Write a protein that binds this ligand. Sequence first.
Ligand SMILES: NC(=O)CN1c2ccc(c3ccccc23)N(CC(N)=O)S(=O)(=O)c2cccc(c2)OC(=O)CCCCC(=O)N2CCC[C@H]2C(=O)Nc2ccc(cc2)S1(=O)=O
Length: 274
Amino acid sequence: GRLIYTAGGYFSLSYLEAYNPSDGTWLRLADLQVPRSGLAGCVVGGLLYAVGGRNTDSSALDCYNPMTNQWSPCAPMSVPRNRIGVGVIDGHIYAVGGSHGCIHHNSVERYEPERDEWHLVAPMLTRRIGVGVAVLNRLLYAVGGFDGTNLNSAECYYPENEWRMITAMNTIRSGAGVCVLHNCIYAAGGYDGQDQLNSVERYDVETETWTFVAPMKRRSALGITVHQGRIYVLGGYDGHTFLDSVECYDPDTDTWSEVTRMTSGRSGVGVAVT
Ligand SMILES: NC(=O)CN1c2ccc(c3ccccc23)N(CC(N)=O)S(=O)(=O)c2cccc(c2)OC(=O)CCCCC(=O)N2CCC[C@H]2C(=O)Nc2ccc(cc2)S1(=O)=O
């Protein structure tokens, strides 16, 4: 009965809408206190947090509670982080990368909801604005992005405080939807400098290889989450228009299938499931 929340986005949007893949119903919920695009979403203990983005870049961390349909302010990050990416480990929110104006972040900071406190951790090997982030059994991955100059590179964070480069992708991707499904890390979509991508690669943590799976039906700044063993990508920008298209990836048949449409097109959204 879990839901897919899309929060904020760009058409900078305040919408918080929830999709049920089991019946095609959308619900519109309480707005983001402050519109934001370029933000990330993630869930801790049933709570949905919206991080970073921009309205002016944003350091805001807000918390949405399905049980109250109310957005609660949290302590802000140590710096603004637009085009951020986030992951959770042990109930802690890791916010990696992003940009504050011309400052392209390689720093990473961790929020403990228990104390409402943000705290710095070991920065990355590379500045990554538009970074993709996912976590696989307490390893945090930052994938792609753009360092202020040039990334196919990916790197991995072990919490117990050092980042390690991993195998590079087959593709240069900033603004790529990144997730973990099963024991693999997916990097769907992105922007290679030239084109929006519809291709998707997954890193098998156990063969340390990026292999392409079927292409999507193109997009950047797309939302991405998992729901009932399936990847859902939301909206994004295909180079010409801001898509309302929501696409679902079934790993069993290795196909991407459009599965719904958002009530309005957006990119720059934060997405999570709870
Ligand atoms: N919160 C934000 O900062 C804003 N948003 C973001 C914008 C960017 C990245 C974002 C990545 C992650 C999350 C959010 C991203 N990326 C760079 C990165 N290092 O990751 S990106 O994914 O690679 C990418 C997306 C879209 C366009 C693009 C590159 O550049 C291009 O293709 C140029 C092609 C022609 C379009 C164009 O001329 N335009 C002139 C200005 C903008 C863009 C525009 O007209 N409308 C627009 C408005 C809002 C958004 C996208 C497009 S947004 O809200 O999603």
